[PDB]
Design a protein around this ligand. Structure first.
Ligand SMILES: COc1ccc(C(=O)Nc2cc(-c3ccccc3)[nH]n2)cc1OC
Length: 300
C-alpha cells in the first residue's frame, strides 16, 4: 500500500479496544487515537477503526482501500461519518473514522420510545425522550448530509436509519456512503442483522431496472422519514420480497404514522412519486425541512 502523509497516523498512536462492528458496517473496533490533530498531540479521541477479518480476500482489501479513497475525495461535512486517518504501512490496513456513541438512528429512536403500558410487548421506561421538533431536526440533518453527498456526485444506494449514526451531541451522521458498488446482484432475499429486508428502502426503478440515482436515494429518504416518525418502526412487517414487488407494481404506499403531520406525510408521499423526475431533490427537502423545524413545537 502507498503512504498518503495527508492521512497517515503512526500505529503506536492507536489504542485498539472493543469490537463495535459486525453489528453492521464491517470489521470494526472502538479505539483511542493519540494526537490525531497537531494541536495537540497529547489528547485522546475515541474513534471507530475499520479493518479486515482473518479470512479476508484481495477483493475484500481492494474494497476497503476504495471506501477510504472515496471518503478522501468526498471531503468533510457535519452530517456524514468523516475520515480521520489511516494506518497503511507495516501492518494490517486500518481506516479511522468518526465514532458515534449513540449507535444507529433505528436503535436511538427505539430506545426513546414512550414507556411501556400493560398492553405492550410494559417495563420499557427510558430516561430519554424526543419532542416533535427533535424528530423533524433529525430528518433535517439527514437531508443536509444527503444534499452534501449529492453535491459531491455521491449516490448512497442504501440510505436507511440503520446507516445513520448518532453522536454524543445528537448529531446525525450518514454512514456507508463510500462503499464499493457490488456487481451484479444484490441478494433481494438477504436480511440485515435485525432480520429486515433492504429491498424495503429501494425505489422501484432501482429494484426493477437497476437504475440508481439521487432520485432513488430521495425515495429511500421517504422510507427513512417514515422510520423517524414511527420511532424506529419496521417498514412492511411480515411482507416477503415477492409480496413487496406486487405492492410496488400496484402503486401501494405506506400509511401515515400517528406521530406525523399531514405536511410531513405529503413530503414522504412526494419522495415516493412513481415518476423519479417528479420527486423533490435533497436541496428542496433541506429548504422545506428547515422551514418546518422552525414551525414545529418542542412542547410535546
Ligand atoms: C451504545 O451503543 C452503541 C454505541 C456505538 C455504536 C457504534 O457502532 N458506533 C459507531 C460505528 C461507527 C462507524 C462508522 C462508519 C464505519 C464503521 C463504523 N462509528 N461509530 C453502536 C452501539 O450499539 C450497537
Amino acid at each position: 500500500l502507498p503512504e498518503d502523509p495527508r492521512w497517515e497516523l503512526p500505529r503506536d498512536r492507536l489504542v485498539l479496544g472493543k469490537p463495535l462492528g459486525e453489528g453492521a458496517f464491517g470489521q470494526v473496533v472502538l479505539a483511542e487515537a493519540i494526537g490525531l490533530d497537531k494541536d495537540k498531540p497529547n489528547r485522546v479521541t475515541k474513534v471507530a477503526v475499520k479493518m479486515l477479518k482473518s479470512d479476508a480476500t484481495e477483493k475484500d482489501l481492494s474494497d476497503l482501500i476504495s471506501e477510504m479513497e472515496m471518503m478522501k475525495m468526498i471531503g468533510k461535512h457535519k452530517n456524514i461519518i468523516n475520515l480521520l486517518g489511516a494506518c497503511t504501512q507495516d501492518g494490517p490496513l486500518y481506516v479511522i473514522v468518526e465514532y458515534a456513541s449513540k449507535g444507529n438512528l433505528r436503535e436511538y429512536l427505539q430506545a426513546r420510545r414512550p414507556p411501556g403500558l400493560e398492553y405492550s410487548y410494559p417495563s420499557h421506561n427510558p430516561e430519554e425522550q424526543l419532542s416533535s421538533k427533535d424528530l423533524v431536526s433529525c430528518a433535517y440533518q439527514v437531508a443536509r448530509g444527503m444534499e452534501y453527498l449529492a453535491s459531491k456526485k455521491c449516490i448512497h444506494r442504501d440510505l436507511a436509519a440503520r446507516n445513520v449514526l448518532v453522536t454524543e451531541d445528537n448529531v446525525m451522521k450518514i454512514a456507508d456512503f463510500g462503499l464499493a458498488r457490488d456487481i451484479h446482484h444484490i441478494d433481494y432475499y438477504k436480511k440485515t442483522t435485525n432480520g429486515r429486508l433492504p429491498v424495503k428502502w429501494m425505489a422501484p426503478e432501482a429494484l426493477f431496472d437497476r437504475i440508481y440515482t439521487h432520485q432513488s436515494d430521495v425515495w429511500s429518504f421517504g422510507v427513512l422519514l417514515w422510520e423517524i416518525f414511527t420511532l424506529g418502526g419496521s417498514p412492511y412487517p411480515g411482507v416477503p420480497v415477492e409480496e413487496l414487488f406486487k405492492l410496488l407494481k400496484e402503486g401501494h404506499r405506506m400509511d401515515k404514522p400517528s406521530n406525523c403531520t399531514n405536511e410531513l406525510y405529503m413530503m414522504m408521499r412526494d419522495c415516493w412519486h412513481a415518476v423519479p423526475s417528479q420527486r423533490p431533490t435533497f436541496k428542496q427537502l433541506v429548504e422545506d425541512l428547515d422551514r418546518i423545524v422552525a414551525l414545529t413545537s418542542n412542547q410535546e
